Amino acid sequence: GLVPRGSMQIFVNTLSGKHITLEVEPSDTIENVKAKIQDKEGIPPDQQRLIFAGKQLEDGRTLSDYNIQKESTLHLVLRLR
């Protein structure tokens, strides 16, 4: 068979506004999450910013830290500098 899919699904609103579905665990780190977005979108993790409930998610924290529950949407944005 295959490795298991994540226990929980969340969505990412990508750069064009289309959503992608991520397979995750509450204990996944924001780095893990950015890698998953890199897999789906081709965007390097070091360019990604993820907003949920007004908070930019930070590397070193997990999804549970931010009380991100099933079917929540993370908002993907990059940077103008």
Partner: protein, 328 residues
């Protein structure tokens, strides 16, 4: 003429100055600072590493007691934000919306009315709107401040399985909305694209809890609660990474968002009062702000040290990146 003070660039700090001026001209936030109402919301004193609200408020006070053409230095404020959020240490150009999110987060945390955040549940017996209201109350048990009173709204996300027809609903708080560039393209087209039914299939099939299998689902946003201050962030990022420079036609008054409401409402009409502009390339570009003075209704360009008059007809440009709307 009041509040027309420039801010000195400290070295690639135009991102900071742009956002500060947008907040300076956020009427209720400005007044919160001028009337020193934060003092009652702070639960203890600060030290040199935790004086974010204190230094923010003093800067706003300085701007609104200046004479026109005065140039103000935000060095003490910058010291405080970088201590709260070490990414702002040093003198590289930064993204204005990233700075916005960190600044409001720190301001909020410092004046949060909740001092001991409490440590979920099955709400399927409830109708949509009642569940939304319960989720809102739960959010406010953790996050409740005068800054939140201004910026916080609630998104309703609806996820419908095309097999069994179960529509699963979640309610996410938001402090701003980052909108896709749709399709001249209008701001309404962007909000329509944000809220459009999104067909999730192929590698994006969710797992439906009822069917216990991967199913084609339809996901759609509506706005459950509209904030007093609506910050709209335009996703100026193209795939083929580089900046999307599309002209987005946004209205200065009468942005009517009733169509995107979860329920029939009348309190979803906004007027523009500030714009954060980014000009130039993805790297090495520059920030300015156009702001409407809350007292006179006249617009000014704020470009670091230089504050100059402008016509409302010159506010709408392709450099608009963050739009600050207030309920009418």
């Amino acid at each position: 003429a009041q509040g027309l003070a420039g801010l000195r660039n400290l070295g690639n700090t135009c991102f900071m100055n742009s956002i500060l001026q947008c907040l300076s001209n956020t009427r209720e936030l400005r007044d919160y600072c001028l009337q020193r109402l934060y003092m009652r919301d702070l639960h203890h004193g600060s030290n040199a590493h935790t004086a974010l609200v204190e230094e923010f408020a003093k800067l706003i006070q300085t701007i609104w007691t200046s004479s026109p053409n005065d140039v103000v230095s935000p060095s003490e404020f910058k010291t405080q934000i970088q201590r709260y959020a070490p990414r702002f240490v040093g003198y590289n150009q930064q993204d204005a919306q990233e700075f916005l999110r960190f600044l409001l987060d720190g301001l909020h945390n410092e004046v949060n009315r909740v001092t001991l955040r409490p440590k979920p549940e099955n709400l399927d017996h409830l109708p949509d709107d009642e569940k939304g209201r319960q989720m809102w109350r739960k959010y406010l048990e953790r996050e409740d401040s005068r800054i939140g009173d201004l910026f916080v709204g609630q998104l309703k996300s609806s996820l419908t399985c095309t097999d069994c027809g179960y529509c699963s609903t979640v309610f996410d708080p938001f402090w701003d909305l980052s909108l896709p560039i749709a399709k001249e393209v209008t701001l309404m087209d962007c909000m329509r694209l944000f809220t459009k039914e999104d067909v999730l299939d192929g590698d994006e099939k969710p797992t439906c809890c009822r069917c216990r299998g991967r199913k084609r689902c339809i996901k759609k946003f509506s706005i459950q609660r509209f904030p007093k201050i609506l910050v709209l962030h335009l996703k100026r990022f193209s795939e083929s990474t580089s900046k999307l420079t599309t002209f987005v036609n946004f209205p200065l008054r009468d942005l009517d968002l009733r169509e995107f409401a979860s329920e029939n409402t009348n309190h979803a009409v906004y007027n523009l009062y500030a714009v954060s502009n980014h000009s130039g390339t993805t790297m090495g570009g520059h920030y300015t702000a156009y702001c409407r003075s809350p007292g006179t209704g006249e617009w000014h360009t704020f470009n670091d040290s230089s504050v100059t008059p402008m016509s409302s007809s010159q506010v709408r440009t392709s450099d608009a990146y963050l739009l600050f709307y207030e309920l009418a």
